[PDB]
Design a protein around this ligand. Structure first.
Ligand SMILES: CCOC(=O)CNC(=O)N(Cc1ccc(N)cc1)Cc1nnn(C)n1
Length: 165
């Protein structure tokens, strides 16, 4: 009836940077929304707290949520290792879009990316499920620690996370 809101408190080499919050589009993509919500609260016994943004590419996107292998090869959903693409109603319209990373059709786990540009060519293959609500300036700050090949110049971590309200 109202979409939930979750936050991440970001750190750079252990030092506090700021907080980003996200509206999750539970109205349109409820299953995909609930996965990210629950990984953010940690209520299933695992999740995003302490994990890193392993791949950041300025002018493209910030990617993380690989909490098992910390490098883009791991993660798992609250539903099993993988779950299906729920739908593609929502599109990659611009900076701040929150979207699922994947390795093929119906291979969603826990990895996600926040867009820092319009990424139209991802439409219909990555499930869009939320957007940055507060702290797009902190996402832009994060982005400056990326590189063309995605390697970060300092360690970008989710020091804390959970649900607002
Ligand atoms: C713009 C979003 O791009 C993608 O989702 C494409 N694949 C990955 O990023 N994966 C592959 C992948 C993604 C999700 C899951 N669940 C498994 C594998 C993770 C990754 N990160 N850095 N590298 C080199 N690969």
């Amino acid at each position: 009836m109202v979409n939930p809101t979750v936050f991440f408190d970001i750190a750079v080499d252990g030092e506090p940077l700021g907080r980003v919050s996200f509206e999750l589009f539970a109205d349109k993509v409820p299953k995909t929304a609930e996965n990210f919500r629950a990984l953010s609260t940690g209520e299933k016994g695992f999740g995003y707290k302490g994990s890193c943004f392993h791949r950041i590419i300025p002018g493209f996107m910030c990617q993380g949520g690989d909490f098992t292998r910390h490098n883009g090869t791991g993660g798992k959903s609250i539903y099993g290792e993988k779950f299906e693409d729920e739908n593609f109603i929502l599109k990659h319209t611009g900076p701040g879009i929150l979207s699922m990373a994947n390795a093929g059709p119906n291979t969603n786990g826990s990895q996600f990316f926040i867009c820092t540009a319009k990424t139209e060519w991802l439409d219909g293959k990555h499930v869009v499920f939320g957007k940055v609500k507060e702290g797009m300036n902190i996402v832009e700050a994060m982005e400056r620690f990326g590189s063309r090949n995605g390697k970060t110049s300092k360690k970008i971590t989710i020091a804390d996370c959970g649900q607002l309200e």
